[model samples]
Target chain A: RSLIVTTLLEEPFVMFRKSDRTLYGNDRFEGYCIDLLKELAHILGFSYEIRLVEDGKYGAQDDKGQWNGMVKELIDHKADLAVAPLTITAVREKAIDFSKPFMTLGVSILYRKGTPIDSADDLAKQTKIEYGAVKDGATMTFFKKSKISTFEKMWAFMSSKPSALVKNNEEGIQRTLTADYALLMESTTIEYITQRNCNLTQIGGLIDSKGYGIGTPMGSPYRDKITIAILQLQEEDKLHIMKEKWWRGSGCP
Target chain B: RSLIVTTLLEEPFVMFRKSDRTLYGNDRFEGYCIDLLKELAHILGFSYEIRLVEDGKYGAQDDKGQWNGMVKELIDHKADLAVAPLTITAVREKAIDFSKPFMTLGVSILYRKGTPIDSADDLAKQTKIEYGAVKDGATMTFFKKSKISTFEKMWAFMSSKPSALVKNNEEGIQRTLTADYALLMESTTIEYITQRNCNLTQIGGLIDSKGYGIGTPMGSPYRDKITIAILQLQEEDKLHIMKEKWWRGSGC
Candidate 1:
């Protein structure tokens, strides 16, 4: 069977080469997800075409609880597979089917090189150090739920502050580097950025852990085949090897 | 032999309990340094007394190239051992003898949680993200040496910024947390602070790597013994265990 795979251009996961004059197709892109797609396609016996998500967002529900990004693309049947670093959350699971988690991550803080604030408590005690989270991210939902007093106060502070809420991790982290701000996003992304930049870092222990899974439309028959392929890859240590290859720039085979 | 060990009251490394009354001696203090002193004394066969550094700063040279902090204490023979996370730098090595490195670290960025900056290059490309380094730190020396054009321009921009050269990492990090600023400091301390605080994070890879070693008076015969003991502890994995026990807790 042939399939359409949607992804985002995130570093170490799904990266696009720097050119446009003649570069096109799958060869024009590279990263963990791209490599992962190749392995899965070979194992499952499917030829696939790659497409970048139009909105450049992973997926989020708007005020009306409408899905956007790759999730929407899947629901609209525009694509048959979402092979990106898309987080698996309860909200998304309710809207789509996800294979077993291929990777795990957590919420973390991204900040500038020098700041006195250390823990969430430190931020709550201060009025000046403004922080925010991705508006449609699970981290933002965690804070808005007021499950903990610290997060409740943090949400109150961020929601009230002008320009504190960000559209995505890129905007949030960029703002953190540009100002006295903190961005709450996935720790995996934070680790990736911190590794490349000698001026940025991941702060504190993880706030919470979550998984990332391949997404498909609800009740999709291919979910079992995809899940089995992922499981086999994981068991054979191929998943680990692939992660090291692309994520660490260890060179792709 | 009896040794007087000088250390700073930096949290996790060396710490004092809160009490209105003035209780003195090693019992008044506890942490990584205290545990380290115990291990070293056990291995090297010495009785030691712990004393807080009089200057309350890590060693740094002033305009005349004279030292302050534990480095000064060692130079004056006021303390026989400097049992803190004193960085092993070229300047400090000139005035003091250091034991084998107990820890390795490098310079990194400290910032408030929500800022958009990621690397030193990110700071260099933009004018809004103000940054600073310790006035007399190796990190400051690094930028001033103009080893590369990027650092030269960075130094020029920082020097021109209002109040960009900070008195210490504490001041620099505090100012960063309070405003749109970045503080460049040792990665070890950055890791320590970041562990305790969720609102702060380190940015980028290490700018430069250095070791933290126990310090002694220059030409002291005790240097070899201290270095041997440290190496032994490292081999036994005791140093790593002690670090985990003391440095990771006594929470914020």
Candidate 2:
């Protein structure tokens, strides 16, 4: 037994143990990461055991939560591998190793019944295009970052115009169609926008890309093996299969 | 000449007079909105004279961008009607009469890959699911409102596994394929992501909706008439035609 260590955190990844209590692990851990890892252990022929790691020391972190809690676990040797929704950031790259991303995420503008804006270039090139974004919003951010300054006045201009700061993604979307306010949020929000509300289509290029990854320590004994496993899983359509398992139900339908 | 009062702003909405040059007649504004307005004039059998309303007045409290930036050209009888991508909100509804929405515009999330997450119930059901959002983002606001105790934890949870939030969407996407950072940005970001990057796909759902409308002052006689025209245009696939003009070149 190689003592292939694992650390569990939130649900689907790892949950608190019920019944006997004071322990962890349950059937609820059935997500993309979990599915991927189970296959990984089988293929690598490694007997593994999972342990819970403290958040700051091991749990992920966020602005209101842990940003890279699990990553720290792998880097600090609290866990041997991290097969969660790992995102590969440059800073984290120095501390651990990661595999190709498994998922992508981002924001976009949608028209429930009109045309899409297309690309930042499309917006920029149109010296006459009249597009209004939420004042100081992700839309503005895209314009700002892309150096599309022609429409910057839109912020001040939109002040007197009818607008709304949506309460949530779903509500914002609902209003995007029914209300006067043009909502600005994430691309995934638009994806869901169309799903929850019909007659909506995206305008153009995504504001950007955010994909998921699997992580391991830089020098972990299983680094190469784990990376190879991830590549193999992805190549063999296992990754695709797992995605269907995790999201198909809550997805397009 | 029936004064065809038009609201103008940013780019083609009514570009800032390029240094003392205002459009006279049949000058051909050449932009979508301008072109549409011209077409409407011809169809309505009016010898239309286009008068420029203040750049900021199309969607204002007064339906004119003149006084306090709320000029009353329309109310003051300076023009007959307003044609623009004016947003019709409640506050404006009290002051202006707007045609039924010509277009609804809203913020949306885009990804070269993955499906949209629509309802809170959908989000609540994902156990170990990891989500990434821009810091201080509108989408982040939506997630916070999602009432998930750890709405903000997704990034950390995935990143704690050490996920990523690159400086921007492109790097974020490149990282998605080469590294492990699942990016979260806006629809434009995803559009660019899908274009710049390849084999990535984006499914719709998870976002807010926004619309565009034609505004007229409250009780304006043109309200119903303009709405009819817009509805007619929509029925005739004119809206689809407008969309095609912008999307065809960008790989839409």
Candidate 3:
């Protein structure tokens, strides 16, 4: 059966090529996810069409604890398969089922050139150097709900700062370079930014390591088939090759 | 005249002790800046009073291009001197005068454990993850002013993402740990956070290394005197001793 797959426009994962406008079907895009999607389609013996999520969010709960973004697209039955760099958190799992994790990542810091502080403890010890996380992101929630004394202490320190909570990564990064500030985001994005801008860098280690997975409508018949296909790809070392090709290939080192 | 000195409650630079309430005048605080202030007052032969900035900002220009925070306090003639770990940026320099830099630092990354990506190129090649910086800082301005094609592409990518801009480092960092995100912040703070938490780490090299300097009201008579005092302290290694006593001292 032909299936509907929902994804997002991210680099090395799902990107529209320069000629995408002239290309028809599948050929319009290229990335690690695109290659993986082709392999899964071949193994599962099904044809599928890809569509970008309009909202561009990775799927988090709204203020009322309602699911939104790509996760909601799948739950509404509008999409049978969701393929992207979707983080597999427990909250999103309630509404949808995820296949085996395809990748792993965690949070990181983005900063401007020449800041003296090094880690969260450095931040905790000081009050003037302001830092932040996204307003409704899972990381922000973690700090707010943490039972650990260290995180609690950090949360309090952050909360006391004037408007320390930022709206997005761009603004957070923008501020880090422009002011006496720093940003907390995913490790992957931090790595990417540092490579592109020599003036920017990432510090400290990652926190809250987690996995990402392909998603399906809960209990969809294709779940097992896709999961098996993914395992096969990993076992064959195809996943590793695809990742190298997209992440490090055809680019300046 | 008893000069009014403006500052913020940054630790290691200036902090009020538990018994600060019971203490009077200069005895209420301690830290690197506090000690430096004392030395500056002694050298300049002026009596001073320390007061915290009411707005808690380090002084940056707002949308209307008007100054706010500690800088505004000085510009508005409310404070004769501004002391803290204030960064010496060209923008701030235009707004006020600064003493010689006392410390140097640069931008760096702060991340959580077990992340595969390592540098900005890694992020540029992918789309699934997100990152952030403070809303109104020099680092943010750097990205906007970058002429490099890769940076321009990244800036475009980040701007395209919904709600990617954040208000401060705390929010940006808090989001980093909870979501698939990373934060760009000052290198020094990143080092401190990493030391306290075993799970956190710093990645890559330092970016745009710069210095921090003491600030004062524009055209203030004390500017030259404060600068000379700072130079003397550096020469005698008193600044070094003060840093050790405050930053790496008791309690932590």
Q: TM-score of every model?
A: 0.49, 0.34, 0.47
lDDT per residue, candidate 2, B89-121, as tens digits?
A: 433444455555555443343333554554333
lDDT of 2 by residue, A1-253 (tens): 6443455453333434344445344343445556676787798887666554454233333465333466767766666776654434433444565554555555456664554555544544543433355433334434333322534444334443434443234455556666544454555445544654456667665544433456676655565456456544543446656655544323333
10 residues in a row with least lDDT, candidate 1 chain A: A244-253
Query: Which candidate leads in lDDT?
Result: 1
Model 2 - which docking category? Answer: incorrect
Q: How far is candidate 1 from the true structure (C-alpha RMSD, Å)?
A: 19.6
TM-score ranking of the models: 1, 3, 2
Ranking by lDDT: 1, 3, 2
Which parts of model 3 have CA positions greater than 4 angstroms off? A157-168, A249-253, B1-252
lDDT per residue for candidate 3 within B45-123, as digits (tens), equals 9998989899887877878999888889988889998888776665676677665456656666677878887877676
* Residue B116 of model 1, lDDT score: 79
Candidate 1 per-residue C-alpha lDDT over B26-82 given as tens digits, one digit per residue, 9 for 90 to 100:
778877888888887887789988888877877877788788989999999999999
| Candidate 1: tens digits of C-alpha lDDT, residues A1-253 | 6799988888788887777577868878888888889888887788988998988888888889999999999898989999998876656766777765677667778887677767877778888888888877777876776446677798899789748998777787778778888888788887677766656767787775456789998767777567667655643456667766655522222
What does candidate 3's lDDT look like per residue over A10-76, in tens digits?
A: 6667888786358877778888888888988887789998888887776888788788778999889
DockQ, candidate 2, vs. native dimer: 0.01
